[PDB]
Structure formats: structure tokens, C-alpha cells
């Protein structure tokens, strides 16, 4: 079950045993990163094992089987010998990572593998807004990239003041600097290019002073061990957006720094026009870059829109203007504009035949580093072997990789936490696809008053039961504590969702008047609990709170609840309230942080608050306020 899937694989239906008696060959002269891993795998343990790079004495016999590609390797296992041979040092390390996935309980299959990546640079750009990844999280990421053959980590958290304006001019303080030094050492050991990016555009002056401060900063990062560099000009305005100046600065960094040090690897830039919708097809910006930028400098691209999947026509369009294959910055699973959602679905939508048209493929992920590993593991597989990329199987493999102790539970949670909900970027993902038809029918019948299928009722019922099992097991899981810490508030909200659905379904059955009323009041309590989570957890300034199962599950529950309530009201001349989200203030009102808003004559708050201002479309100077007669009211809470 190899991830990424190799270019070529020939399996023999025999198996062999990892030799306790073995002779090692090429150990001294192969990539030391690859040898270390081999030795960990052969721990406390005569069969021939030959390891080396094309050109080493050890692997002379196989030089014609080693693929002629950067990062390529040949791998083979039989009764007599094991071969691990890279076109180059990174290739040998990649052989070892493939070999590690073949070893299962001291047993190896008989296989012959020729393998190499279809895309040259593959990995992660930590390039989102929000809380930057923790130091420990980054340490974990770099190991994960090594294991999955991602060779690129671009460091560029938008809210790191030493990366963006104005402190991009200042060297990192000692503590952050020793942490970065450590990240580079760890990157180098897992064969990952640590790429340090800088984001100076918003207040850069095009003078010598700013140019030398930038080069002075790159020099300080070089002292920390950094060997690849990027300059980002995304999401800025003003003079920094000038294409001629941008190119001159980049060429100057190229000529006076990248092409002058002994050992610099990647030099990459991100344009102000970084996707088609944000480009001016009649303006000179992209063609200037394409014509003026030195040919070894990479140019990044997010596709047809800020958030978008990569199409053949889309990348043709950019490649023809920039005069080189774009280096893709893919904006998924980044959730910095839908901060109340987790995006845990599969990676899909990118053309799988366009490898030759791209220099690079990196994923911009969520501020939730462990949770992002599902998409990241999948991107590593897509970028290495797009031809064979399998969306759903890779998603499942990622999950079982990340949380083998509770894979089905995490699968359950992930598959109902995938869509983004409505947003201004217009990007959406599928969610809850398996149960969607059953949901769809149940709610057709029910609404129009025709009878639903029992098996559809039970499917819904089975799902809620499963959700509860997953939520509870994930909450207590101690295999990946950092992952659990990330998802926990979502897990609680997910459990509540499932209980609400069970209770709403008990209302549909509805023995008698007083059963129905017990169920109904329970539902109301559960709504209120969801509100309290949504108001107390993840209270960020942009999209505060906690949404889950939003595409299919919550709407089905809400709409079912509103419906039974209405039938009951008719049948009993009752006046039960049918509203679906709890709201403590009377008038659809909404609560966000200290705001109280009627969704874009009179409001009554659950209490007297000091008021702050009322924006329709006046300051309230702390006046006590309970009644009020865009429409956002801000209070002190």
C-alpha cells in the first residue's frame, strides 16, 4: 500500500524475512540520512544489502536500472539481496522511505521498484493568516514530509512580524532564531529544503536602504543554516506592487546572493497578481515578470481564483505569460477565511495529467497543523505520482497513518467535516456524500407529507450512533494528543449534532403527546449547548466559533425539527417554537463576540449591558442598554 505510489512496481507473490544475518555494502558512501534510517530498521540484527547513489561502487551492478531523474531510485528485494540505489542522495533517502512502508512484521515482499517524482518541488507553504504553527508542530511536520517525499517547506506565516511588515527588516530575536536554526537542522535530516520567505511589499521603499536591509536579513537567515529563499508580494497595495521593481529586486538577490553563495538551492517569488481573477489581462504586470525575471527564479500561482483547483487551461494561461512552468501554491486546506470550519476532506480537483506544466506544487494548510496532515499526505502523493493519484484511497491511507489506533473514528469525523460553507471565495467541497441521498429522500417524503422509507430512517439513525462513538473515542485518544487538542471543540459540537439528530428522529416516531414534548425540550437544550460552544470556543476576530456537519447533516436535522414541530402544532393546536438555533435575545438575530446582529422594529437582550455602538446600513458611550428600537449592536460583555 505504498504512498506515494511508485512510477513502476513489479511485485512477486513471495515474501522474504528481514535478515538478522546480513552484509551491508555501501554504508560508508551512501547518503548518511538514508543509512541512519536503514540502521534503525535493522536495529539489533549473511544476506546482501547494497545501498548507494549512482556512481558508488556498491550499486555499479544496477546503474542501468536506477531511473535517470532527480530524486529517482531503484529498489529490489529477493531471497539473496536487497538493493537501495538513488540517482542522487535524495533518491537514496526516498528508497529508504518506500522500503520502510514495505517492512511489515519483519517481512518484506519480493518487489522491484523504479520510482521518481513527476513534479520537481513538492510540499507545504506555511503561508496563511492566523496563529503560526507552534515550534513542536513544525518539528513534527518536517518528519512527516521526509516520510512522504515532500522536499519543500516554505516558511511564511502572514502574522509572523519578522516575516511581514514592518519587522521583516529586523533579525529574529535569539529565541526564535535558535528555534529556526533547529528547524533547518531537522529539515536537512529529512531531505526537505527549508525555504525562508519574506513579505516586504506593503512598506518596502525601492531605495538602497531597504534593498540592503532585505539582503542583510537573508544573510542573517543564511547564518541560521537556511539555503533557499522566497520573496512574497501577495495581498499588498501601493508601490510594492510595481512589476519592474519587483523583478529588479529579485534579479539583484539572484545575482548578488543566490548565484554568489556556495550552496543556495531554491529562489522563489509570489506575484501580486497571483491568480487569474486578480490579474489584469490588459495590464503589464505578469508579462513584465515573465520577460524580466531571471530564468532560475520560480513564480508562484494559486490558479484561476484566490482559492482554486489547478486545470490544464488554467496553468497554460499563466505559463504563457510568465514564460516558465508555474510553481503552484494551492490554497487548500487553508481555512483562514472560514475559521469556524475544519477542512478534513480528501484532496481532489487538480488535473492529474499536467505535471510537465508545473515546476512546483505546495499546499497552504490550516493553522491546525496535525489536522492538515490528511491534506498534506495527499498532496505528497498527488505531486509525486499524479498519473496514479487516488483521491479516496489516499485520504483513507493518510487517516490510518495519522491515527492508526482510531482510523475509522477519524474517518467518520473527517467525512462530515469537509465543506467550507458559503464564503466570498466561492470555494466548496463535498461533504457527507454517502448519506446524502437517504437524507434527501427522507426530507422529500416528510415535507410534502408522503411516507418515508424505513431503511432511510435507519441509515440516518446508524450515522448519528456512529458519530457519537467517533466523538467520544477521539476525545479520549492519547496516540496523537496534539491532533485531539486541535479538533476537540469540533468534536464536542459534532457529538451534540449527533444527539440532536437522534432526538429529532425520536420526535418523528413520536409515541404520544408527552414523549414528543420530552424529546422536543431535550432538543431545545441541545441547541442551547451548541450555541454555548459556538460562543465560547475558537473566539477569533474573523469567523468565531464552531461549525460542523454543515453541508447535509445539520440542515437535515434543522429542517426535520422545524417540520415535526409544525405538524404537532396543527395536530394539537399547540404553539411550540420551531426555530432551530438557540438565541438568548428576542426580536434571525445573531451573536458574534460582543456583537448582536439581525442577519444582513425592536431587539430585547437577555439583560442590561453597557452599550458601545449601533451600526445600521452612533457611539453609545457605555449607556446601560437592554431594548433597541446591516444592523449590528456592540456591547461590553
Residue 329 known to bind ligand: yes
Residue 510 known to bind ligand: no
Look-up of cell digits 513471495: 14
| Torsion 522-526-528-532 (CA) sign | positive
Residue 549, judged by CB atoms within 10 A of its CB (0-12, 13-18, 19+), counts as buried
Residue 291 known to bind ligand: no
Residue 134 CA from chain centroid, whole number: 15
Residues 623 and 534 in one domain: yes
Total domains, the chain: 3
Resolution (A): 2.0
* CB hemisphere CA count around 178 (13 angstroms): 2
Residues 468 and 351 in one domain: no
Domain closes at, from 402, 418, 452: 402
C-alpha cell belonging to residue 371 = 489536522
Residue 427 known to bind ligand: no
What are the residues facing 232 on neighbouring strands?
270
CATH of the domain at 45: 3.30.379.10
CATH of the domain at 149: 3.20.20.80
d(CA 418, CA 412): 11
Q: Which domain holds residue 251?
A: 117-402
Domain closes at, from 356, 378, 402: 402
C-alpha cell belonging to residue 73 = 531510485
Residues 419 and 386 in one domain: no
Residues 303 and 212 in one domain: yes
Domain closes at, from 387, 402, 417: 402
Residue 79, judged by CB atoms within 10 A of its CB (0-12, 13-18, 19+), counts as exposed
* Apex 287 CA angle, 283 and 290, nearest 5: 155
Residue 22 known to bind ligand: no
Do residues 298 and 304 lie in contact, with contact meaning Cβ atoms separated by under 8 Å? no
Give the number of other CB atoms < 10 A from CB of residue 286: 25
Residues 186 and 210 in one domain: yes
Residues 362 and 420 in one domain: no
Look-up of cell digits 454517502: 434
d(CA 50, CA 231): 42
Residues 37 and 136 in one domain: no
What are the residues facing 109 on neighbouring strands?
15
Residues 95 and 126 in one domain: no
Where do breaks (C to N over 2.5 Å) occur in the chain, by preceding residue number?
A: 45, 587, 600, 617, 629
**What is each CA distance from 371 to 275, 529, 536, 579, in whole angstroms?**
26, 25, 21, 33
Residue 336 known to bind ligand: yes
What are the residues facing 47 on neighbouring strands?
22
Residue 274 known to bind ligand: yes
From the list 286, 584, 574, 551, the residue with the least C-alpha distance to 439 is 551
**Whether 453 is catalytic:** no
Strand-pair category, 631-635 with 595-598:
antiparallel
User: How was this one solved?
Assistant: X-ray
Residues 105 and 214 in one domain: no
Do residues 80 and 14 lie in contact, with contact meaning Cβ atoms separated by under 8 Å? no
- Phi, psi at 502, each rounded to 5°: -55, -35
First-to-final CA distance of the chain: 54
C-alpha cell belonging to residue 567 = 405538524
**What is each CA distance from 168 to 181, 183, 208, 532, in whole angstroms?**
17, 19, 16, 40
Q: Treating both helix axes as pointing N-terminal to C-terminal, what angle do 285-292 and 243-253 enclose, rounded to 10 degrees?
A: 20
Give the number of other CB atoms < 10 A from CB of residue 357: 18
d(CA 444, CA 363): 39
Give residue 130's region: left, alpha or beta (phi > 0; psi -120 to 50): left
From the list 284, 283, 315, the residue with the least C-alpha distance to 299 is 315
CATH of the domain at 493: 1.20.58.460
Residues 106 and 128 in one domain: no
d(CA 461, CA 166): 55
Do residues 562 and 578 lie in contact, with contact meaning Cβ atoms separated by under 8 Å? yes
**What is each CA distance from 563 to 512, 551, 594, in whole angstroms?**
17, 19, 32
Residues 443 and 397 in one domain: no
Q: Where are the alpha helices (DSSP H) in 154-230?
A: 174-189, 208-223
d(CA 61, CA 356): 31
Catalytic residue among 160, 203, 210, 235: 235
Q: What is the Cα gyration radius of the chain?
A: 28
Residue 193 known to bind ligand: no
Do residues 92 and 31 lie in contact, with contact meaning Cβ atoms separated by under 8 Å? yes
d(CA 560, CA 149): 47
With a CB cutoff of 8 Å and minimum separation 6, the contacts of 292 are 243, 244, 247, 248, 251
What are the residues facing 417 on neighbouring strands?
none
Residues 473 and 619 in one domain: yes
Residue 330 known to bind ligand: yes
Amino acid at each position: 500500500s505504498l504512498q506515494p505510489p511508485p512510477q513502476q512496481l513489479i511485485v512477486q507473490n513471495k515474501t522474504i524475512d528481514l535478515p538478522a544475518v546480513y552484509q551491508l555494502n555501501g554504508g560508508e558512501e551512501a547518503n548518511p540520512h538514508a543509512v541512519k534510517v536503514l540502521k534503525e530498521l535493522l536495529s539489533g540484527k549473511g544476506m546482501l544489502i547494497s545501498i548507494g547513489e549512482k556512481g558508488d561502487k556498491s550499486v555499479r551492478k544496477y546503474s542501468r536500472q536506477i531511473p535517470d531523474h532527480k530524486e529517482g531510485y531503484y529498489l529490489s528485494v529477493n531471497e539473496k539481496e536487497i538493493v537501495l540505489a538513488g540517482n542522487d542522495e535524495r533518491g537514496t533517502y526516498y528508497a529508504l522511505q518506500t522500503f520502510a512502508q514495505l517492512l511489515k512484521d519483519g517481512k518484506l515482499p519480493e518487489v522491484e521498484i523504479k520510482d521518481y517524482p513527476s513534479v520537481r518541488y513538492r510540499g507545504v507553504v506555511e503561508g496563511f493568516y492566523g496563529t503560526p504553527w507552534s515550534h513542536q508542530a513544525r518539528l513534527s511536520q518536517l518528519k512527516f514530509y521526509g516520510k512522504n517525499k515532500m522536499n519543500t517547506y516554505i516558511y511564511g506565516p502572514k502574522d509572523d512580524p519578522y516575516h511581514s511588515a514592518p519587522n521583516w527588516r529586523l533579525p529574529y530575536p535569539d529565541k526564535e532564531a535558535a528555534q529556526l536554526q533547529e528547524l533547518v537542522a531537522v529539515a536537512n535530516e529529512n531531505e526537505v529544503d527549508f525555504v525562508w520567505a519574506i513579505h516586504p511589499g506593503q512598506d518596502i521603499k525601492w531605495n538602497k536602504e531597504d534593498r540592503d536591509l532585505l539582503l542583510a536579513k537573508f544573510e542573517k537567515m543564511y547564518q541560521l543554516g537556511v539555503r533557499s529563499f522566497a520573496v512574497f508580494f501577495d495581498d499588498i497595495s501601493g508601490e510594492g506592487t510595481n512589476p519592474q521593481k519587483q523583478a529588479e529586486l529579485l534579479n539583484y538577490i539572484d545575482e548578488k546572493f543566490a548565484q554568489v553563495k556556495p550552496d543556495i538551492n531554491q529562489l522563489v517569488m509570489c506575484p501580486t497578481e497571483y491568480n487569474k481573477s486578480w490579474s489584469n489581462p490588459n495590464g503589464n504586470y505578469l508579462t513584465t515578470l515573465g520577460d524580466k525575471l531571471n530564468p532560475s527564479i520560480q513564480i508562484m500561482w494559486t490558479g484561476d481564483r484566490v482559492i482554486s483547483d489547478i486545470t490544464r487551461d488554467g496553468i497554460s494561461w499563466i505559463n504563457e505569460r510568465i514564460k516558465r512552468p508555474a510553481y503552484i501554491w494551492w490554497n487548500f486546506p487553508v481555512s483562514d477565511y472560514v475559521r469556524d470550519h475544519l477542512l478534513l476532506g480528501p484532496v481532489y480537483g487538480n488535473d492529474t495529467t499536467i505535471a510537465k506544466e508545473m515546476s512546483g506544487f505546495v499546499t497552504n494548510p490550516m493553522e491546525h497543523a496535525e489536522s492538515s496532515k490528511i491534506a498534506i499526505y495527499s498532496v505528497a502523493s498527488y505531486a509525486w505520482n499524479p498519473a496514479k493519484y487516488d483521491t479516496w484511497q489516499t485520504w483513507k491511507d493518510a487517516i490510518r497513518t495519522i491515527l492508526p489506533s482510531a482510523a475509522e473514528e477519524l474517518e467518520c469525523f473527517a467525512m462530515h467535516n469537509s465543506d467550507l460553507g458559503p464564503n466570498g471565495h466561492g470555494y466548496r467541497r463535498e461533504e457527507s456524500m454517502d448519506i446524502q441521498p437517504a437524507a434527501e429522500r427522507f426530507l422529500k417524503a416528510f415535507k410534502e407529507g408522503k411516507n418515508y422509507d424505513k431503511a432511510d430512517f435507519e441509515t440516518l439513525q446508524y450515522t448519528f450512533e456512529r458519530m457519537k462513538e467517533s466523538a467520544d473515542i477521539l476525545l479520549m485518544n492519547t496516540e496523537n494528543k496534539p491532533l485531539i487538542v486541535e479538533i476537540t471543540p469540533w468534536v464536542h459540537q459534532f457529538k451534540l449534532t449527533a444527539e440532536m439528530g437522534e432526538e429529532v428522529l425520536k420526535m418523528v416516531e413520536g409515541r404520544n403527546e408527552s414523549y414528543f414534548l420530552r424529546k422536543y425540550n431535550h432538543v431545545k437544550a441541545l441547541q442551547q449547548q451548541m450555541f454555548y460552544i459556538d460562543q465560547t470556543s475558537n473566539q477569533n476576530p474573523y469567523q468565531p466559533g464552531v461549525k460542523t456537519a454543515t453541508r447535509v447533516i445539520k440542515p437535515l436535522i434543522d429542517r426535520t425539527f422545524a417540520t415535526v414541530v409544525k405538524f404537532f402544532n396543527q395536530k394539537f393546536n399547540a404553539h411550540l417554537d420551531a426555530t432551530t438555533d438557540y438565541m438568548p435575545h428576542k426580536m434571525p438575530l445573531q451573536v458574534k463576540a460582543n456583537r448582536v446582529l439581525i442577519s444582513p422594529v425592536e431587539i430585547e437582550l437577555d439583560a442590561i449591558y453597557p452599550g458601545e455602538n449601533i451600526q445600521i446600513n452612533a457611539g453609545l458611550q457605555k449607556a446601560p442598554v437592554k431594548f433597541v428600537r446591516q444592523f449590528v449592536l456592540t456591547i461590553e460583555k
